[PDB]
Amino acid sequence: FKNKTVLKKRCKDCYLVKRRGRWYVYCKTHPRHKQRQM
Amino acid sequence: GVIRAIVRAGLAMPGPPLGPVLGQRGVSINQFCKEFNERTKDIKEGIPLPTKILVKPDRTFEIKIGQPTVSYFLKAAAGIEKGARQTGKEVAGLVTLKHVYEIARIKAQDEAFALQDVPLSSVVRSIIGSARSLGIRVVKDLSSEELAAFQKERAIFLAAQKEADLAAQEEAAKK
Amino acid sequence: EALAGAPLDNAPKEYPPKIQQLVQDIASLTLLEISDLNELLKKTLK
Amino acid sequence: IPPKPAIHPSCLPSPPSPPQEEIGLIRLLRREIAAVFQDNRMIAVCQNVALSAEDKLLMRHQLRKHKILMKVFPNQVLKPFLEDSKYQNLLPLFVGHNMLLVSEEPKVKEMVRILRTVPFLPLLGGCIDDTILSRQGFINYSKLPSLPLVQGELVG
Amino acid sequence: VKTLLPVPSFEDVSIPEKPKLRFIERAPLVPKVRREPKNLSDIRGPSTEATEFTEGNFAILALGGGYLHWGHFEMMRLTINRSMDPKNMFAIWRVPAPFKPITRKSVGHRMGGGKGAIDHYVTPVKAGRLVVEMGGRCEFEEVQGFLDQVAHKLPFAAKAVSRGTLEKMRKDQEERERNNQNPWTFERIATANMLGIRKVLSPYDLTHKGKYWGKFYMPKRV
Amino acid sequence: FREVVETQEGKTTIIEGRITATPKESPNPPNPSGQCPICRWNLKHKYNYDDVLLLSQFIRPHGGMLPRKITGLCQEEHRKIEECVKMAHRAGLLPNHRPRLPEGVVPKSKPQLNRYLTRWAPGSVKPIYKKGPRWNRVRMPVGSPLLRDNVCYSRTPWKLYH
Amino acid sequence: SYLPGYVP
Amino acid sequence: AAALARLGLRPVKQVRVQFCPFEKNVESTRTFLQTVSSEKVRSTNLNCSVIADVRHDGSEPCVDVLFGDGHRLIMRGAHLTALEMLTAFASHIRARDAAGS
Amino acid sequence: ALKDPDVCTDPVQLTTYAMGVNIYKEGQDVPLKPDAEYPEWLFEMNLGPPKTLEELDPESREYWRRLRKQNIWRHNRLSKNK
RNA sequence: CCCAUAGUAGGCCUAAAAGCAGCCACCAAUUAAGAAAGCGUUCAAGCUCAACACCCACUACCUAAAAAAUCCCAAACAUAUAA
Ligand code: FES
Ligand SMILES: [K+]
Ligand SMILES: [K+]
Ligand SMILES: [Mg+2]
Ligand SMILES: [Mg+2]
Ligand SMILES: [Mg+2]
Ligand SMILES: [Mg+2]
Ligand SMILES: [Mg+2]
Ligand SMILES: [Mg+2]
Ligand SMILES: [Mg+2]
Ligand SMILES: [Mg+2]
Ligand SMILES: [Zn+2]
């Protein structure tokens, strides 16, 4: 992923989800939009 | 799919802009110009005609033809050869409401307005909005006395634009 | 003031009540009266 | 230290929401709807299935050759008008995307054959000559001979 | 029938000839020679100038004290002039150009030997002052985006506001002072020197009333 | 309550919905002016994770929470019950509301650790290797801040961090 | 059979 | 329509929806017809037919789905939502498609 | 190379006949008819600028089209900066 | 969530400028849909948003992190009436 202190969606297919105690951003269309809460 | 573009009557060319479009589809480019030029033969050459091309899964085409654009009708009806560069600030041409009625009585025969089954009033109110985009002004009464005065003053304006326009070209060379 | 709902497609024909009176009234009249009515009817309908 | 009310305001009955004057467009649709049911006598309620914008304009154009209009009104404006009216039993039809096929003269036979091309377009019901009907009633009124002949049936 | 609403009309608004922000120079026209003291009380406490709107309707509000150098002015200028529509917007400066000289000694020198030489100039800012004022045929939602982007890069706590939000902000604070259920306030105690509390306070605390600590402003304090 | 069933006969599948007996609210509520079932019965600030008779009325057969537009709860109380149900499952107080296991699954034997007042999901919690100094201690959360306004009968208020 | 101040 | 169009009516042969409009339990069935009769779904398989037969016999509504394999799916919508009917409809599409191939 | 066909310039001719109307080569120009023969609604049209919102009738479709068109313009301005 | 037809490729500039390089206008068909707010095309195509219809998404718009070197660092605790 990419560790970010301020998560932000970069397209319409990005979706927020809370896992393992922290927020993530996943995207199946563009896997480079993936972010991890720091 | 469907391809729709504006094509001059009797002047279809195998090259661009329409050539490369048909190439991607794989449709025969020469057959189009053959059929089209032979179908628009009765129509005067150089008139823009909206064309809609229907493509079948076997790269077979059945062209579709429409009536000329409103811009052609309005320009011709006014004598103007070229629309205004700026609208609302200068008047390029001048036509009547009688022309607009003879232009809607023939423009309402096209696929678009016909399939809607609208009255001729709704078409005349759409052609006055396109005339404004051109700069043309729609007047109720227009006698040849004042149509020859405005037409005479329009050339004065056109001549001035050449001087200003040509002045910029000469300045560009000095740069 | 509220039109009656449509009768079911499988239900037996339920004829309207207002006409039931008309059906009976025609039987009471005499043919000569019915005939006179009819001559005016045919012309009125044309 | 912010004040704390003894009872949370949400737990208490909220005051009724202030009324709001009806929009001008609403009181315009009602005037057009009334005209529809009053002016023309044949009214067929159909379901506005998701036909393509072209296949939905081509059909509407065919319905015009025979002088059959295709009106569309919102169900929230067309339900109240029916709740207080003669046509109070047409209410259950208006659930979802619907439209009105209306004509001053009933040309049912001419509309049905146009609706048979699309098997997934259902003619739910109608109201002819202030008489409510189902679909199967439209199929019969279509097969029923013209009125002038029926006028002659008794004469004959 | 989704209910539509009227829209505000800005036809009555006029746009100046130079809507963009003018350029700010590093130093004043004539360089200063007399060196000045630090005078830190120019960024301490509430502001008594440029606290109200003059021409525009949206601005950047300062929620703390600080000094602005040239680097800050360029960031505000470029960011605003790039992100704004010159035709329907205009912006102006509510702060003067850097005038306060800041001395600095050369690297490696020990304490003493006099005072340093003028290095750069700054502009002192107090809390409650408007830094940039914007206006024109635009709503606040349009400018609020890039104005906050600018406000976040300033050396003090700032925030974009409008004639409405600013007014509401002030009225909400007055409401808090009135409905406060706590019978004990900083003002009452300090002014009466209850508990001998003025032995740990400052004379400025009689006027700031606990809402200010150095250059920092605390809006949640009543 | 509604149920759905599928019956396969002669390679043909049939799906039906059948209504079932539905429970009815008890009559004569103490506070008929209440807006949600909680204030109508004077239960606001008076329930905890261990009051399962109350919590079972707002969950599904498999342990899931019910929507707020169905139960009629207020967002403030729906969030409390949603958190008290999470802590009841973790404490083992809802053993008949377990998740549905697909055909052919036998849960493995896992260390049985008794716990209560568990705010966070066990697997998503990392150990505190560095407690920190007395003024910046890393506390262990116990309970929920959503239940902080609950009726306390003691002089010491609810401690939420150990 | 519930008074105004009854709590289950 | 979007979720059902990505899948496609490939194995399907015919779909028939019957309901009584005047009855007060046909909202689900009429909503199911609104999506299946969409240009997105119908386009996936032109051969696949979609029929709507209206009735006024006071009978319950049903959705009968004929597949190419010969299997049939029936959903009685009086006490079923459109989403439930659509979901079950999709699941069978996926199963029957895999069986054929 | 492709150009619009040449248009005549003769005041008397333009007012008498509509030049662009006829497009066929074998056909003839369309002469304008007198005023009485044209319909009645053709000389009450809006030659000038569009009617403002304050001039229209609230209970009219043309009033809400203008109001809906102004809110689409607003949605676009607000979204542009985003 | 849902859905998208048309005067028209508006005019001018331009090799080309087709809602989206720039300047001008920003009117109008249809119950309803900007002479186009965001991607995109060499230009076009093409995907969304604002529209109608359907009917309750019937939200918040007040804060976003953390790492050093001998070995973490009292032990523990949410519910019996403020002493
Ligand atoms: S507790 Fe009173 S509204 Fe939910
Ligand atoms: K800052
Ligand atoms: K362009
Ligand atoms: Mg419109
Ligand atoms: Mg257009
Ligand atoms: Mg053009
Ligand atoms: Mg353009
Ligand atoms: Mg396009
Ligand atoms: Mg472009
Ligand atoms: Mg523009
Ligand atoms: Mg939309
Ligand atoms: Zn993405």
How large is the C-alpha radius of gyration of chain C? 16
Instruction: Provide the pairing of β-strand A35-37 with B137-139.
Output: unpaired
Is-contact D103 D63, C-beta < 8 A? no
| Residue at token pair 């043919």 | C31
DSSP-derived 3-state class of residue D100: strand
According to DSSP, residue I24 is labeled B
Is-contact B81 I4, C-beta < 8 A? yes
> Nearest 5°: phi and psi at E162?
-135, 175
Q: How many CB pairs under 8 A join D and F?
A: 14
Q: B4 is written with which tokens?
A: 């729709």
Q: Where does residue D74 rank: exposed (0-12), middle (13-18), buried (19+ CB within 10 A)?
A: exposed
Answer yes or no: is the C-beta of F43 below 6 A from any ligand 1 atom: no
DSSP-derived 3-state class of residue H98: helix
DSSP-derived 3-state class of residue H66: strand
Through-space distance between the first and last CA atoms of chain H, rounded to whole angstroms: 25
On the CB side of B6, how many CA atoms lie within 13 Å of its CA? 11
Q: Where does residue F49 rank: exposed (0-12), middle (13-18), buried (19+ CB within 10 A)?
A: buried
Interatomic CA distance for residues E92 and E109, integer angstroms: 42
Interatomic CA distance for residues B167 and B161, integer angstroms: 9
Long-range contacts of C15-24 (CB under 8 A, 24+ apart): none
CA of E160 to the centre of ligand 2 (A): 13
Q: Considering Cα of E205, then E207, then E209, then E211, what sign does the dihedral take?
A: negative
Q: Which nucleotides of J are covered by protein (CB under 7 A)?
A: 1-13, 16, 18, 23-38, 42-46, 48-55, 57-58, 60, 64-65, 68, 72-82
| Residue at token pair 């960011």 | E79
Alpha carbon dihedral B86, B88, B93, B94, in 10-degree steps, equals 170
Q: What residues have CB less than 8 Å from F114, skipping those under 6 apart?
A: F92
Interatomic CA distance for residues D2 and B83, integer angstroms: 69
Category of E81 on φ-ψ map: left (φ > 0), alpha (ψ -120 to 50) or beta: alpha
DSSP-derived 3-state class of residue E158: strand
Give the nucleotide nearest to A6 (CA→C1'): J64
Q: F73 is written with which tokens?
A: 């709860």
Is-contact D142 D109, C-beta < 8 A? yes
Is-contact E92 E53, C-beta < 8 A? no
Q: D33 is written with which tokens?
A: 């709807």
Answer yes or no: is the C-beta of F52 below 6 A from any ligand 1 atom: no
Alpha carbon dihedral I21, I22, I23, I28, in 10-degree steps, equals -170
> Nearest 5°: phi and psi at H88?
-55, -40
Instruction: Provide the pairing of β-strand A3-4 with A35-37.
Output: parallel
| Residue at token pair 């004043």 | E28
Is-contact F37 G8, C-beta < 8 A? no
Is-contact I66 I53, C-beta < 8 A? yes
| Residue at token pair 């902080």 | F148
Helices within F13-141 (DSSP H only): 37-40, 52-55, 68-71, 75-91
> What are the angstrom distances between the C-alpha of C9 and each of D42, D95, D139, H54?
20, 22, 12, 11
CB-nearest to D23 from E3, E179, E181 is: E3
Interatomic CA distance for residues B94 and B78, integer angstroms: 6
CA nearest D151 in C: which residue?
A: C45
CA A2 to C1' J43, in angstroms, rounded, equals 38
Closest CA to E150 of E90, E87, E92, E77: E77
Answer yes or no: is the C-beta of F97 below 6 A from any ligand 1 atom: no
Closest CA to E4 of A25, F2, D25, F155: D25
Q: Where does residue E220 rank: exposed (0-12), middle (13-18), buried (19+ CB within 10 A)?
A: exposed
CA A29 to C1' J10, in angstroms, rounded, equals 38
Contacts of residue G8 in chain F, CB cutoff 8 Å?
41, 43, 54
E strand or H helix at E212: strand E212-213
Interatomic CA distance for residues D11 and I56, integer angstroms: 46
Give the nucleotide nearest to I79 (CA→C1'): J37
Interatomic CA distance for residues E190 and E211, integer angstroms: 13
Interatomic CA distance for residues E8 and E152, integer angstroms: 30
Provide DSSP, B105-156: HHHTTSHHHHHHT--HHHHHHHHHHHHHHHT-EEES---HHHHHHHHHHHHH
Answer yes or no: is the C-beta of F38 below 6 A from any ligand 1 atom: yes
CA of B71 to the centre of ligand 6 (A): 10
Interatomic CA distance for residues B172 and C6, integer angstroms: 83
Boundaries of every domain in chain B? 1-66, 67-140
CB contact under 8 A, B116 and D57: yes
How large is the C-alpha radius of gyration of chain G? 5
DSSP-derived 3-state class of residue E146: helix
CATH superfamily of this structure's domain B1-66: Ribosomal protein L11/L12, N-terminal domain (3.30.1550.10)
Which chains contact G through at least 3 pairs of Cβ atoms less than 8 Å apart? F
Alpha carbon dihedral H24, H25, H28, H29, in 10-degree steps, equals -100
B49-78 residues touching I, CB cutoff 8 A = 68, 72-78
User: Beta partners for D21?
Assistant: none
Q: Is residue I3 within 8 angstroms of chain E, CB to CB?
A: no
According to DSSP, residue A38 is labeled -
Q: What residues have CB less than 8 Å from D32, skipping those under 6 apart?
A: D73
Category of B147 on φ-ψ map: left (φ > 0), alpha (ψ -120 to 50) or beta: alpha
Q: Which amino acid is at F12?
A: T
Q: Which amino acid is at E131?
A: V
Q: Considering Cα of H17, then H22, then H27, then H30, what sign does the dihedral take?
A: positive
> What are the angstrom distances between the C-alpha of F77 and each of E163, F23, F85, F101, G4?
38, 21, 12, 30, 21
Q: Which amino acid is at B111?
A: E
> What are the angstrom distances between the C-alpha of C3 and each of B123, C16, D133?
42, 12, 11
Is-contact E100 E36, C-beta < 8 A? yes
Q: B31 is written with which tokens?
A: 């057959």
Residue nearest atom 1 in ligand 1 by C-alpha distance: F39
Category of A14 on φ-ψ map: left (φ > 0), alpha (ψ -120 to 50) or beta: beta
DSSP-derived 3-state class of residue H96: helix
How far does CA B82 lie from the centroid of its chain? Answer: 10
Interatomic CA distance for residues B78 and B95, integer angstroms: 6
Category of F72 on φ-ψ map: left (φ > 0), alpha (ψ -120 to 50) or beta: left
Q: Which amino acid is at I78?
A: L
Q: What residues have CB less than 8 Å from E51, skipping those under 6 apart?
A: E128, E129, E130
Q: CA triplet D102, D105, D110: central angle to 5 degrees?
A: 75
Interatomic CA distance for residues D69 and D99, integer angstroms: 10
Is-contact D70 D63, C-beta < 8 A? yes
Interatomic CA distance for residues F78 and F67, integer angstroms: 9
Interatomic CA distance for residues H81 and H63, integer angstroms: 12
Interatomic CA distance for residues B15 and B30, integer angstroms: 10
Q: What residues have CB less than 8 Å from I44, skipping those under 6 apart?
A: none
DSSP-derived 3-state class of residue D106: coil
Instruction: Provide the pairing of β-strand D98-103 with B137-139.
Output: unpaired
DSSP-derived 3-state class of residue A21: coil
Instruction: Provide the pairing of β-strand F12-19 with H72-76.
Output: parallel
Closest CA to E126 of E51, E68, E46: E46
Ligand 1 binding pocket mutation candidate from F31, F33, F36, F47 (most atoms within 8 A of CB): F36
Ion ligand 12: residues, Cβ under 5 Å: A 11, 13-14, 27, 30, 33
How large is the C-alpha radius of gyration of chain D? 22
CA of E158 to the centre of ligand 2 (A): 7
A 10 A CB-CB count for D114 gives 16
Which chains contact H through at least 3 pairs of Cβ atoms less than 8 Å apart? C, D, F
Q: Can the peptide bond before residue B17 be classed as cis, meaning omega within 30 degrees of 0?
A: yes
CA nearest D76 in E: which residue?
A: E1
Closest CA to E91 of E124, E129, E58, E127: E58
Q: Nearest-CA residue to the C1' of J26?
A: B133
Q: What residues have CB less than 8 Å from D54, skipping those under 6 apart?
A: none
How much of chain D is in helix, strand and coil states, percent to nearest 5? Answer: 40, 15, 40
> Nearest 5°: phi and psi at I41?
-85, 0
Q: E145 is written with which tokens?
A: 């985006």
> What are the angstrom distances between the C-alpha of D100 and each of D44, E155, F6, F53, F109?
6, 66, 38, 53, 65
According to DSSP, residue H79 is labeled G
CA of D100 to the centre of ligand 5 (A): 29
Question: Which method was it determined by?
Answer: cryo-EM
A 10 A CB-CB count for E211 gives 19
Q: What residues have CB less than 8 Å from D21, skipping those under 6 apart?
A: none
Is-contact H93 H54, C-beta < 8 A? no
Q: What residues have CB less than 8 Å from B152, skipping those under 6 apart?
A: none
Q: Is residue H49 within 8 angstroms of chain D, CB to CB?
A: yes
Interatomic CA distance for residues D68 and D45, integer angstroms: 13
> Nearest 5°: phi and psi at D60?
-60, -35
Q: F146 is written with which tokens?
A: 């959503």
CATH (one of 1.10.1840.10, 3.40.1130.10, 3.40.50.720, 1.10.10.250) for B67-140: 1.10.10.250
Structural domains of chain D sorted by starting position, each given as residue range(s) with its CATH number in brackets: 1-144 (3.30.70.1730)
DSSP-derived 3-state class of residue B131: helix
> What are the angstrom distances between the C-alpha of I64 and each of B126, D29, E5, I57?
19, 13, 10, 9
Through-space distance between the first and last CA atoms of chain F, rounded to whole angstroms: 43
Is-contact D97 H31, C-beta < 8 A? no
Q: C8 is written with which tokens?
A: 């079911």
Interatomic CA distance for residues E209 and H57, integer angstroms: 82
> What are the angstrom distances between the C-alpha of D48 and each of C39, D113, H62, H93?
49, 17, 20, 26
Interatomic CA distance for residues I20 and I23, integer angstroms: 7
The reported resolution of this PDB entry, expressed in Å, is 2.6
Contacts of residue I67 in chain E, CB cutoff 8 Å?
4, 6
Is-contact H20 H59, C-beta < 8 A? yes
Interatomic CA distance for residues E189 and H50, integer angstroms: 83
Interatomic CA distance for residues H93 and F16, integer angstroms: 19
Longest alpha-carbon distance in chain I: 58
DSSP-derived 3-state class of residue B123: helix
Is-contact D63 D101, C-beta < 8 A? yes
- Which of F4, F6, F16 best tests the H interface by mutation, with the highest count of H CBs <10 A? F16
According to DSSP, residue E111 is labeled S
Q: What residues have CB less than 8 Å from F108, skipping those under 6 apart?
A: none
Closest CA to D136 of C3, H29, C20, H21: H21
**How many residues does this entry show for chain G?**
8
CA of I72 to the centre of ligand 7 (A): 20
Helix (DSSP H) and strand (DSSP E) numbers for chain D: 6, 5
Q: CA triplet E184, E186, E191: central angle to 5 degrees?
A: 105
| Residue at token pair 């467009």 | D25
B99-118 residues touching D, CB cutoff 8 A = 114-117
Interatomic CA distance for residues H89 and H36, integer angstroms: 11
Closest CA to D114 of D145, D147, D142, D74: D142
Instruction: Provide the pairing of β-strand E158-162 with E130-136.
Output: unpaired
User: Beta partners for A23?
Assistant: A18
Instruction: Provide the pairing of β-strand H12-19 with H49-54.
Output: parallel
Helices within E16-162 (DSSP H only): 70-83, 140-152
DSSP-derived 3-state class of residue E181: coil
Q: D144 is written with which tokens?
A: 């029923």
Provide DSSP, D31-68: HHHHHHHHH-SEEEEEE-----HHHHHHHHHHHHHTT-
CB contact under 8 A, D10 and F34: no
Interatomic CA distance for residues B18 and B78, integer angstroms: 30
According to DSSP, residue D24 is labeled T
Is-contact E102 E122, C-beta < 8 A? yes
E strand or H helix at F127: none
User: Beta partners for B6?
Assistant: B50
Contacts of residue H33 in chain D, CB cutoff 8 Å?
47, 49, 120, 122
On the CB side of I26, how many CA atoms lie within 13 Å of its CA? 2
> What are the angstrom distances between the C-alpha of A6 and each of A9, A36, D58, D61, E156?
10, 9, 52, 55, 21
Interatomic CA distance for residues H24 and F50, integer angstroms: 44
Ligand 1 binding pocket mutation candidate from F31, F33, F35 (most atoms within 8 A of CB): F35
Cβ-count burial H40-73 (b if 16+ within 10 Å, e if not): ebbeebeebbbebebbbeeebbbbebbbbeebeb
